[PDB]
């Protein structure tokens, strides 16, 4: 800022940048919906592992 | 775009593939034999099995019960000559 000797707009954008400094924040909104495709992952999972575990000592 | 899940769909799998069919043949194939030659009764008597036991199982095989056969004729219509000339 101390470069520019007829500074009159580094203030202006300085304040703009701090205006915005709360930019914009992320989602870990599902919590939903991953619930729900890990449940029929890890359903399937164990039936797999149930049923080869079984067909194994058969 | 998500997880794709191919690792554990063998549940319903296990049907359709080829082999499925000879495993669940020969687990039926399996379980009712006998095991090692048991409930044989390798010996039975009712006036003519010791003759099959001597002569006609896969172990003595030879011909001579035809040979005792054959002297069974040679013993019957010679008799008949003796009732006929």
Same mark, same amino acid.
């Given at each position: 800022r101390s470069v520019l000797k007829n500074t009159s707009v580094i203030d202006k954008i300085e304040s703009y940048v701090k205006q915005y400094k709360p930019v914009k924040i992320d989602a870990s909104k599902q919590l939903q919906v991953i619930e729900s495709f890990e449940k029929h992952a890890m359903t399937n999972a164990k039936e797999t592992e149930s049923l080869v575990s079984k067909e194994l000592k058969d | 775009v998500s997880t794709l899940i191919?690792?554990?769909?063998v549940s319903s799998k &296990? =049907? !359709? @593939? %080829?082999?499925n069919a000879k495993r669940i043949a020969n687990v039926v194939h399996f379980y009712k034999s006998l095991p090692? !030659? /048991? %409930? /044989?009764? =390798?010996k039975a008597n009712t006036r003519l099995a010791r003759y099959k036991a001597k002569?006609? #199982? !896969? #172990? &003595? %095989? @030879?011909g001579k019960p035809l040979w005792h056969f054959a002297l069974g004729i040679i013993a019957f219509g010679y008799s008949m000559e003796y009732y006929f000339h």
């Open positions: - | 191919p690792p554990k769909v &296990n =049907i !359709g @593939s %080829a082999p090692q !030659g /048991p %409930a /044989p009764a =390798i002569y006609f #199982d !896969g #172990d &003595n %095989a @030879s």
